[PDB]
Design a protein around this ligand. Structure first.
Ligand SMILES: *[C@@H]1O[C@H](CO)[C@@H](O[C@@H]2O[C@H](CO)[C@@H](O[C@@H]3O[C@H](CO)[C@@H](O)[C@H](O)[C@@H]3O)[C@H](O)[C@H]2NC(C)=O)[C@H](O)[C@H]1NC(C)=O
Ligand SMILES: *[C@@H]1O[C@H](CO)[C@@H](O[C@@H]2O[C@H](CO)[C@@H](O[C@@H]3O[C@H](CO)[C@@H](O)[C@H](O)[C@@H]3O)[C@H](O)[C@H]2NC(C)=O)[C@H](O)[C@H]1NC(C)=O
Ligand SMILES: *[C@@H]1O[C@H](CO)[C@@H](O[C@@H]2O[C@H](CO)[C@@H](O)[C@H](O)[C@H]2NC(C)=O)[C@H](O)[C@H]1NC(C)=O
Ligand SMILES: *[C@@H]1O[C@H](CO)[C@@H](O[C@@H]2O[C@H](CO)[C@@H](O)[C@H](O)[C@H]2NC(C)=O)[C@H](O)[C@H]1NC(C)=O
Ligand SMILES: *[C@@H]1O[C@H](CO)[C@@H](O[C@@H]2O[C@H](CO)[C@@H](O)[C@H](O)[C@H]2NC(C)=O)[C@H](O)[C@H]1NC(C)=O
Ligand SMILES: *[C@@H]1O[C@H](CO)[C@@H](O[C@@H]2O[C@H](CO)[C@@H](O)[C@H](O)[C@H]2NC(C)=O)[C@H](O)[C@H]1NC(C)=O
Ligand SMILES: *[C@@H]1O[C@H](CO)[C@@H](O)[C@H](O)[C@H]1NC(C)=O
Lengths: 175, 133, 48, 49, 35
């Protein structure tokens, strides 16, 4: 219920979040990963569906959804986890990581003694993530299938009326 | 099964906020739950420091966090302000204060330290009295 | 007087949080609340 | 609700292995989660009692 | 301020842990200061 905003400073204890936070250069305030997701998925048949078939627009637009996502991201990296259970507090990231480790089952010192190494490992992992999406074409099947199914259903319904259904003729007036 | 017969842990499943309990009630073709939950009130902010080095050795909170109001440091819980004096029964040691970043300086006051001092002073006064006889 | 208007939705307040690398926040008081919740459990039987 | 706003103890629910945190991203008619998980590396064997 | 609290003795194990040496030391101090 609060649209939190990212701070101007961007030094998160050595971690590098530049690949997920919104990008102001683009007119749309998306991010690099979101940009790749939008490019990979491909959505005049829509104009030919005029025969009584409409596609109403969603209530929420893409910018609004991006704003929600930005609010969540700015909350989870500055307030920790408490912003989902009442008043939103503020905790430095380098020790919220320690709290997460404590939750796992390992003590605190193991983090602070290897802070820089863990930061480098996380940076390398987040960088390598992008290539996996960018290279192969089967990564985003679970969303391509939905739009393909809808297109197939619409095409079948439209093409159905060409069938004569055992009547004299498919065209109405000639009867 | 989860919210009623026990205290759940999945956040935002048995009521918004930290979950205390629930009560069931019937309704025509349905059920109604009353989730009794807990929510932190107004808050104050302080200056923190992840570690403490006293005798050249780092110190970490047992279960809590290190806060300070400007002059004296304290260790407290994570969900309710209640400071205590820094004690060895609240801290555990690891390594030496050279590798961690953000550490600060303070004194670590073991409570067993004055516990044993309560007889160290006894021994000192005994021997001071015994110097002459 | 009264009239029908159209406009753009509001997502709520802003409430920027001043993150810092040596700043912590601790509540000093609490509250206890009760939240209701409703769930259907069985539709009416039928026969034809 | 679980893997983002908190740390989940449900094994193999918020990522293969022990779970630390997650990040959401939007996509056309869908969402994409990035689960940051933790996995033990090479080990050594000892004698126990 | 707490309700329903009862009366008893709380026995810190540090008390016998010290005492096993402290009473012996007290006997030694009796044997120490007297002569
Ligand atoms: C930050 O918190 C500390 C801890 O409470 C404050 O230091 C302590 O302040 C109290 C009074 O607020 C001092 O108590 C003293 O008691 C003697 C009687 O024994 C009395 O004569 C003094 O006039 C005073 O009231 C206490 O000595 C002092 N130090 C400690 C170690 O407890 C500090 O004032 C707080 N600072 C801020 C900016 O809030
Ligand atoms: C926390 O306290 C410790 C000691 O109480 C501080 O270490 C001390 O640091 C100062 C300055 O860095 C040292 O003074 C100088 O050290 C050089 C050697 O680098 C020496 O050649 C000079 O003559 C002078 O003594 C001091 O020696 C050093 N203490 C010890 C025992 O070596 C530390 O800086 C403090 N840190 C914080 C964050 O308060
Ligand atoms: C955070 O990461 C991004 C991308 O991983 C960094 O941006 C690149 O940084 C390298 C530094 O070797 C440059 O050569 C590239 O030209 C940068 N690319 C872009 C698009 O900016 C960024 O520098 C990192 N920042 C921090 C503070 O770690
Ligand atoms: C503790 O938090 C309060 C707010 O709850 C801080 O006070 C304001 O914080 C906002 C946050 O962006 C600033 O824009 C204001 O300038 C602050 N006002 C004042 C009068 O400080 C307060 O600064 C925080 N405590 C510390 C030590 O920073
Ligand atoms: C925590 O908050 C509660 C209320 O949310 C405070 O209790 C109130 O205290 C004032 C002043 O003493 C009374 O006028 C109210 O009647 C109290 N509320 C109720 C419901 O009785 C309580 O004092 C706060 N705690 C602290 C330490 O400030
Ligand atoms: C627990 O023990 C204390 C210690 O004796 C009791 O406190 C006494 O109470 C009586 C009656 O009120 C007084 O006359 C004494 O002066 C009190 N002594 C002290 C040292 O406080 C207390 O009443 C006992 N409570 C219970 C429930 O047994
Ligand atoms: C917080 O970050 C700023 C920016 O680099 C730095 O100057 C400051 O020393 C940091 N604070 C601590 C306690 O390290």
């Amino acid at each position: 219920k609060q649209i939190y905003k990212t701070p101007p400073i961007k030094y998160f204890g050595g971690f590098n979040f530049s690949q997920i936070l919104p990008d102001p250069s683009k007119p749309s305030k998306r991010s690099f990963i979101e940009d790749l997701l939008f490019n990979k998925v491909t959505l005049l048949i829509c104009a030919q569906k005029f025969k009584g078939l409409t596609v109403l627009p969603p209530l929420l637009t893409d910018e609004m959804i991006a704003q929600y996502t930005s609010a969540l991201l700015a909350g989870t990296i500055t307030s920790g986890w408490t912003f989902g259970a009442g008043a939103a507090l503020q905790i430095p990231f380098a020790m919220q990581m320690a709290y997460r480790f404590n939750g796992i089952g390992v003590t605190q010192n193991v983090l602070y003694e290897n802070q820089k190494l863990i930061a480098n490992q996380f940076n390398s992992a987040i960088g390598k993530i992008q290539d996996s999406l960018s290279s192969t074409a089967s990564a985003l099947g679970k969303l391509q299938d939905v739009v393909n199914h809808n297109a197939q259903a619409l095409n079948t319904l439209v093409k159905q009326l060409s069938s004569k259904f055992g009547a004299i003729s498919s065209v109405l007036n000639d009867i | 099964s989860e919210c009623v017969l026990g205290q759940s842990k999945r956040v935002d499943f048995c009521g918004k906020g930290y979950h205390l309990m629930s009560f069931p009630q019937s309704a025509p073709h349905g059920v109604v739950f009353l989730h009794v939950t807990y929510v932190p009130a107004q808050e104050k902010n302080f200056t923190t420091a992840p570690a403490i080095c006293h005798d050249g050795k780092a110190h970490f909170p047992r279960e809590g966090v290190f806060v300070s109001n400007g002059t004296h440091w304290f260790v407290t819980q994570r969900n309710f302000y209640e400071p205590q004096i820094i004690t060895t029964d609240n801290t555990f040691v690891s390594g030496n204060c050279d590798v961690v970043i953000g550490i600060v300086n303070n004194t670590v006051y073991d409570p067993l330290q004055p516990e044993l001092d309560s007889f160290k002073e006894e021994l000192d006064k005994y021997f001071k009295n015994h110097t002459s006889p | 007087s009264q009239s029908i208007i159209a406009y753009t939705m509001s997502l709520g307040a802003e409430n920027s949080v001043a993150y810092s690398n040596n700043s912590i926040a601790i509540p000093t008081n609490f509250t206890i609340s009760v939240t209701t919740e409703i769930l259907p459990v069985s539709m009416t039987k039928t026969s034809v």
